[PDB]
Write a protein that holds these residues in place. Sequence first.
Motif, PDB file in Angstrom:
ATOM      1  N   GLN A  71       0.872  -1.157  -0.101  1.00 17.34           N
ATOM      2  CA  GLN A  71       0.074  -0.032   0.069  1.00 17.34           C
ATOM      3  C   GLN A  71       0.938   1.429  -0.121  1.00 17.34           C
ATOM      4  O   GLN A  71       2.122   1.222   0.074  1.00 17.34           O
ATOM      5  N   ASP A  72       0.318   2.420  -0.286  1.00 15.45           N
ATOM      6  CA  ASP A  72       1.070   3.701  -0.313  1.00 15.45           C
ATOM      7  C   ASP A  72       1.101   4.119   1.377  1.00 15.45           C
ATOM      8  O   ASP A  72       0.488   4.941   1.739  1.00 15.45           O
ATOM      9  N   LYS A  73       2.216   3.544   2.072  1.00 15.57           N
ATOM     10  CA  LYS A  73       2.472   3.850   3.394  1.00 15.57           C
ATOM     11  C   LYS A  73       3.688   4.767   3.395  1.00 15.57           C
ATOM     12  O   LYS A  73       3.549   5.725   4.286  1.00 15.57           O
ATOM     13  N   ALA A  74       4.701   4.483   2.784  1.00 17.13           N
ATOM     14  CA  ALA A  74       5.815   5.417   2.810  1.00 17.13           C
ATOM     15  C   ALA A  74       6.363   5.570   1.395  1.00 17.13           C
ATOM     16  O   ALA A  74       6.695   4.689   0.588  1.00 17.13           O
ATOM     17  N   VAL A  75       6.092   6.851   0.932  1.00 11.80           N
ATOM     18  CA  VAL A  75       5.985   7.104  -0.289  1.00 11.80           C
ATOM     19  C   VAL A  75       7.142   8.396  -0.707  1.00 11.80           C
ATOM     20  O   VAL A  75       7.251   9.289   0.359  1.00 11.80           O
ATOM     21  N   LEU A  76       7.777   8.436  -1.814  1.00  8.38           N
ATOM     22  CA  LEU A  76       8.554   9.509  -2.080  1.00  8.38           C
ATOM     23  C   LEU A  76       7.889  10.068  -3.598  1.00  8.38           C
ATOM     24  O   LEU A  76       7.424   9.278  -4.422  1.00  8.38           O
ATOM     25  N   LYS A  77       7.481  11.472  -3.497  1.00  6.59           N
ATOM     26  CA  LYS A  77       7.024  12.191  -4.697  1.00  6.59           C
ATOM     27  C   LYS A  77       7.822  13.368  -4.755  1.00  6.59           C
ATOM     28  O   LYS A  77       8.778  13.927  -3.979  1.00  6.59           O
ATOM     29  N   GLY A  78       7.529  13.944  -5.914  1.00  2.81           N
ATOM     30  CA  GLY A  78       8.028  15.427  -6.084  1.00  2.81           C
ATOM     31  C   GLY A  78       9.224  15.337  -6.591  1.00  2.81           C
ATOM     32  O   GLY A  78       9.701  14.269  -7.223  1.00  2.81           O
ATOM     33  N   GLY A  79      10.284  16.323  -6.482  1.00  3.35           N
ATOM     34  CA  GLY A  79      11.613  16.329  -7.102  1.00  3.35           C
ATOM     35  C   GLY A  79      11.615  16.269  -8.545  1.00  3.35           C
ATOM     36  O   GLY A  79      10.988  17.086  -9.020  1.00  3.35           O
ATOM     37  N   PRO A  80      12.265  15.385  -9.076  1.00  6.29           N
ATOM     38  CA  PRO A  80      12.417  15.377 -10.535  1.00  6.29           C
ATOM     39  C   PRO A  80      11.280  14.159 -10.963  1.00  6.29           C
ATOM     40  O   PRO A  80      11.309  13.824 -12.082  1.00  6.29           O
ATOM     41  N   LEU A  81      10.477  13.854 -10.081  1.00  6.80           N
ATOM     42  CA  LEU A  81       9.774  12.364 -10.312  1.00  6.80           C
ATOM     43  C   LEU A  81       8.390  12.761 -10.832  1.00  6.80           C
ATOM     44  O   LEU A  81       7.706  13.640 -10.463  1.00  6.80           O
ATOM     45  N   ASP A  82       7.854  11.746 -11.765  1.00  7.70           N
ATOM     46  CA  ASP A  82       6.252  11.721 -11.988  1.00  7.70           C
ATOM     47  C   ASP A  82       5.639  10.801 -11.143  1.00  7.70           C
ATOM     48  O   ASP A  82       6.080   9.503 -11.326  1.00  7.70           O
ATOM     49  N   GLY A  83       4.758  11.021 -10.601  1.00  9.96           N
ATOM     50  CA  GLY A  83       4.158   9.767  -9.618  1.00  9.96           C
ATOM     51  C   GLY A  83       4.740   9.194  -8.573  1.00  9.96           C
ATOM     52  O   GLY A  83       5.381  10.046  -7.843  1.00  9.96           O
ATOM     53  N   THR A  84       4.351   8.538  -7.995  1.00  6.95           N
ATOM     54  CA  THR A  84       4.069   7.912  -6.588  1.00  6.95           C
ATOM     55  C   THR A  84       5.213   6.905  -6.712  1.00  6.95           C
ATOM     56  O   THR A  84       4.997   5.855  -7.243  1.00  6.95           O
ATOM     57  N   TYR A  85       6.298   6.710  -5.836  1.00  7.75           N
ATOM     58  CA  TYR A  85       7.112   5.800  -5.478  1.00  7.75           C
ATOM     59  C   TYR A  85       7.065   5.047  -3.931  1.00  7.75           C
ATOM     60  O   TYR A  85       7.291   5.871  -3.099  1.00  7.75           O
ATOM     61  N   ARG A  86       7.016   3.802  -3.836  1.00  3.00           N
ATOM     62  CA  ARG A  86       6.878   3.490  -2.716  1.00  3.00           C
ATOM     63  C   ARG A  86       8.292   3.021  -2.227  1.00  3.00           C
ATOM     64  O   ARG A  86       9.050   2.236  -2.735  1.00  3.00           O
ATOM     65  N   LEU A  87       8.519   2.982  -0.830  1.00  3.12           N
ATOM     66  CA  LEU A  87       9.685   2.551  -0.212  1.00  3.12           C
ATOM     67  C   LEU A  87       9.642   1.028  -0.136  1.00  3.12           C
ATOM     68  O   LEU A  87       8.593   0.675   0.515  1.00  3.12           O
ATOM     69  N   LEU A  88      10.558   0.286  -0.485  1.00  2.00           N
ATOM     70  CA  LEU A  88      10.841  -1.214  -0.516  1.00  2.00           C
ATOM     71  C   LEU A  88      11.715  -1.425   0.524  1.00  2.00           C
ATOM     72  O   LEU A  88      11.589  -2.608   1.226  1.00  2.00           O
ATOM     73  N   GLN A  89      13.027  -1.010   0.373  1.00  2.00           N
ATOM     74  CA  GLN A  89      13.961  -1.169   1.373  1.00  2.00           C
ATOM     75  C   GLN A  89      15.140  -0.177   1.510  1.00  2.00           C
ATOM     76  O   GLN A  89      15.429   0.689   0.560  1.00  2.00           O
ATOM     77  N   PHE A  90      15.984  -0.273   2.466  1.00  2.00           N
ATOM     78  CA  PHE A  90      17.266   0.536   2.435  1.00  2.00           C
ATOM     79  C   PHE A  90      18.410  -0.416   2.851  1.00  2.00           C
ATOM     80  O   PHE A  90      18.178  -1.256   3.728  1.00  2.00           O
ATOM     81  N   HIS A  91      19.629  -0.018   2.467  1.00  2.00           N
ATOM     82  CA  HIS A  91      20.905  -0.779   2.848  1.00  2.00           C
ATOM     83  C   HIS A  91      21.937   0.416   2.857  1.00  2.00           C
ATOM     84  O   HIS A  91      21.688   1.597   2.305  1.00  2.00           O
ATOM     85  N   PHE A  92      23.008   0.088   2.991  1.00  2.00           N
ATOM     86  CA  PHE A  92      24.220   0.822   3.084  1.00  2.00           C
ATOM     87  C   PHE A  92      25.500   0.037   2.303  1.00  2.00           C
ATOM     88  O   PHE A  92      25.395  -1.167   2.104  1.00  2.00           O
ATOM     89  N   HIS A  93      26.322   0.884   1.931  1.00  2.00           N
ATOM     90  CA  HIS A  93      27.663   0.874   1.265  1.00  2.00           C
ATOM     91  C   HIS A  93      28.708   1.251   2.232  1.00  2.00           C
ATOM     92  O   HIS A  93      28.544   2.509   2.583  1.00  2.00           O
TER      93      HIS A  93
END
Length: 257
Positions: A71-93
């Motif tokens: 579901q649309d619980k944690a999303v990223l919008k705006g910036g250079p983006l068209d539409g709604t992007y959902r958070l799947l994971q985070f990780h590090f290097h």
Amino acid sequence: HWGYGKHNGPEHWHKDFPIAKGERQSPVDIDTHTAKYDPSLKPLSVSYDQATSLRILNNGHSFQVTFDDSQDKAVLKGGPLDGTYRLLQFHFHWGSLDGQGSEHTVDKKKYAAELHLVHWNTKYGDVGKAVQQPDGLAVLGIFLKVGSAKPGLQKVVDVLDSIKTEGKSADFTNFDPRGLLPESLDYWTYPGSLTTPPLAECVTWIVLKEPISVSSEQVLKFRKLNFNGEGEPEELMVDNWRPAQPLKNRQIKASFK
Ligand SMILES: NS(=O)(=O)c1cc(NC(=O)Nc2ccc(C(F)(F)F)cc2)c(O)c([N+](=O)[O-])c1
Ligand SMILES: NS(=O)(=O)c1cc(NC(=O)Nc2ccc(C(F)(F)F)cc2)c(O)c([N+](=O)[O-])c1
Ligand SMILES: [Zn+2]
């Protein structure tokens, strides 16, 4: 298979993943004097208040925290983006020393680590479809420098003992990713790729200008993870970063002067 060692590291990946020599590979060096201020870029919209984290896991090349993306619980919008992007994971290097570890560089400067928050474009229905599209993913990149501790990171640090070796996972609920963000959301953006196989050229990169500070003790605990599985000889998980790739015919845009 692939990894970060002498015999299977990034200089070898093209043999199995020929797109490694492609036209929009990541990471890149961000030359701050040739980046182009773009006034048509909008502020980022990060809506993480409803985020539901699920698991933390060691996948043999990094560690990831996964989220419920049904579901649309944690999303990223705006910036250079068209539409709604959902958070799947985070990780590090991260690196073996404080002067290396990030994948992106800024005027050739390397940071000690880099945080990637991976999001996928909901118009494509599932993340597997999104990786086949030139606008399928958006990755928010945050640099880590060594200094003061980051309180919001400590609860990730405290569980890493339980996922020391590849294939280990643990429940990791009620983690709030808002505690990993810097104060400012000014950013650079460019079209790029995943930085691990399959290296798909499906990513809009959004790299934040302001690094977060973590303590020496916090990054030390990253360096105690293992690439190996349990019951195998110990191999420390360090230097899991890909070097910068040719920019080719791309321009990096900045949201700020
Ligand atoms: N979380 S994400 O960055 O957005 C992300 C999404 C996918 N989705 C896929 O649908 N297929 C796929 C692609 C290559 C392989 C292969 F060939 F590598 F095995 C196997 C399966 C993904 O594979 C990876 N990934 O890392 O492979 C990362
Ligand atoms: N640096 S990066 O390009 O952003 C990057 C990408 C990946 N790959 C995935 O996340 N694969 C994946 C995740 C979920 C699915 C699912 F669940 F959809 F099947 C399928 C595949 C990765 O493991 C790392 N890493 O370092 O751990 C870094
Ligand atoms: Zn990454």
